[PDB]
C-alpha cells in the first residue's frame with residue numbers, strides 16, 4: 001500500500017496550502033470586524049487554533065507516562081516557531097514593530113523567563129496551574145489593550161476562518177499519517193523517526209499559516225501567531241502535561257528558548273525584524289536541531 005501513503009501525504013499538503021490562506025484571510029477580516037490589530041487576532045484566535053495539536057499531544061503522552069515527550073515537544077515547538085517559522089517570515093516580509101507590540105513582546109519574554117526558572121527542578125502540576133493562569137491573563141490583557149444582526153460579510157469571514165483551520169489541522173495529520181504509512185511500507189520505520197515526525201506535524205499549522213500571512217505582507221499577524229503559539233505551548237501544552245505527571249527538567253532547551261526570546265525582543269525594540277534577523281534565527285534553529293536531543 002505504497003500509493004496510499006503518497007495520496008495522504010500530498011492531499012495533506014493540498015489542504016495545508018489552501019487551508020492556511022483561507023485561515024489567514026478569514027482571520028484578517030475578523031480582526032477588522034472586531035476592530036483589533038492583526039497581532040491580536042494572531043496571538044489569540046489563530047494561536048489557540050493551531051496549538052491544539054500540541055495540547056492534545058502533551059496531555060495524552062504525560063497521561064500515558066511519557067512526560068519527557070510532553071515537555072520536549074512543547075519547548076521544541078517554541079524553538080521552531082522563532083527559529084524556523086519567524087525566521088522564514090522575517091525574510092519574506094520584514095517587520096517594523098510598533099512600540100505597543102514591543103510591550104507585548106517584553107511580557108512574552110518575562111513569561112518565558114518565569115517558566116524557565118520554575119522548570120529548573122522540573123514542572124509539577126502546581127507549576128502547570130500557575131502557567132495556565134498566566135496564559136489566561138495574557139490573552140485578556142492582549143485583547144483589552146488591542147480593542148476599541150447577521151452580516152453576510154461576517155458570516156463569510158467565519159466560514160473562511162473555521163474551514164481554513166480544519167484544513168490545516170486535517171491536512172497536517174494527513175501529512176504525518178501519510179508519511180508514517182510510507183515509512184512502514186518501505187520498512188524504514190524507526191520510532192525516533194516517528195516522534196520527531198509527529199512533533200514537527202504539530203508545528204506544521206503555524207508554519208503554513210505564518211508563511212501565508214507573510215506572503216500577504218501581514219507581519220503583525222505572523223509575529224502575533226509566533227508569540228501566541230509559544231505561550232500556548234508553555235501555558236497550555238506544557239501546563240496540561242504537568243497536571244497528569246511531573247515533567248522532567250529540560251534546562252538546556254529552556255536556555256536556548258530564553259536566548260532566542262531575548263533576541264526577538266531586542267530586535268523588535270531597538271531594530272527591526274527583517275532579512276538579517278531572519279537569517280540569524282534560521283542559523284540558530286539549524287544549529288539547535290544539529291546538536292540537541
Ligand SMILES: CCCCCCCCCCCCCCC
Nearest residue numbers: 125126128129132242243244245
Ligand atoms: C481549567 C482546568 C484546570 C484543571 C486543573 C487540574 C489540576 C489537576 C491536579 C492533579 C494533582 C494530582 C496530585 C497528586 C499528588
Ligand SMILES: [Ca+2]
Nearest residue numbers: 050051202203
Ligand atoms: Ca502547533
Ligand SMILES: [Ca+2]
Nearest residue numbers: 118121122123
Ligand atoms: Ca518546578
